[PDB]
């Protein structure tokens, strides 16, 4: 078990420890990894190397960018929590391969645009949190409006920042035809 962490029952906790680098020597069999409340600015490239990992909590960090390699090779991942970071741009293939992912939180970031096709591989995703973001509700967000409107995937919290008449309207219930360019 890393010095900075506690390890119990394949669950590894390194929460609120002032970390900006992944602790060395995390158990190979880790299933739940809690890195909330630290000072990471990037997703560590190594998280891909933990082949049993089904939950990642990186909430309340300083993460400003993702790469198309960030969650690569994580076909087993169930829960991905990126709440309360500094995300804005979401690379189009960031979530590729994540065919087991059920829960995704992007709530509390600086996101205006989620590119179409970003959820192409996310066929098991049942619960999206994407509130507390300045969503720009033009035709480029129309696909997401349609996506959340099947089986209550977003909880009526996320709202358009704009433009114009879209101001303060819920992502969930606003008709997809109103998302125009």
Each residue 24-43 as x (binds a copy of itself by CB under 8 A) or -, in order, gives --------x---xx------
Task: Tell which residue, 131, 123, 117, has the closest CA to residue 172.
Answer: 131
- Cβ closest to a copy of itself, residue 24 vs residue 151: 151
161 near a copy of itself, rule: CB under 8 A? no
CB atoms closer than 10 angstroms to residue 137: 25
Q: For the window 86-105, what string marks contact with a copy of itself as x by the rule CB under 8 A?
A: ----------------xxxx
Instruction: Give me the DSSP letters along 81-124.
Output: E--SS------TTTTTT-TT--EEE--SS------TTTTTT-TT
> Could you list the residues that contact a copy of itself (CB under 8 A)?
15-16, 32, 36-37, 55, 57, 59, 79, 81, 83, 102-105, 107, 126-129, 131, 151-157, 168, 170, 172-173
């Amino acid at each position: 078990c890393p010095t900075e962490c506690t390890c119990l029952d394949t669950v590894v906790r390194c929460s609120n420890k002032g970390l900006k680098v992944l602790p060395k020597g995390i158990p190979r069999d880790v299933t739940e990894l809690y890195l909330d409340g630290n000072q990471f600015t990037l997703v560590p490239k190594e998280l891909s190397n933990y082949k049993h990992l089904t939950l990642i909590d990186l909430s309340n960090n300083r993460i400003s960018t993702l790469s198309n390699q960030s969650f690569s090779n994580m076909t087993q991942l169930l829960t991905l929590i990126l709440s309360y970071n500094r995300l804005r741009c979401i690379p189009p293939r960031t979530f590729d391969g994540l065919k087991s992912l059920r829960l995704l939180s992007l709530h509390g970031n600086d996101i205006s645009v989620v590119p179409e096709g970003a959820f192409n591989d996310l066929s098991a995703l049942s619960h999206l949190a994407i509130g507390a973001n300045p969503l720009y509700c033009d035709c480029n967000m129309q696909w997401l409006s349609d996506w959340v409107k099947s089986e209550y995937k977003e909880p009526g919290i996320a709202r358009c920042a704009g433009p114009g008449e879209m101001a303060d309207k819920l992502l969930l219930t606003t008709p997809s035809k109103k998302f125009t360019c």
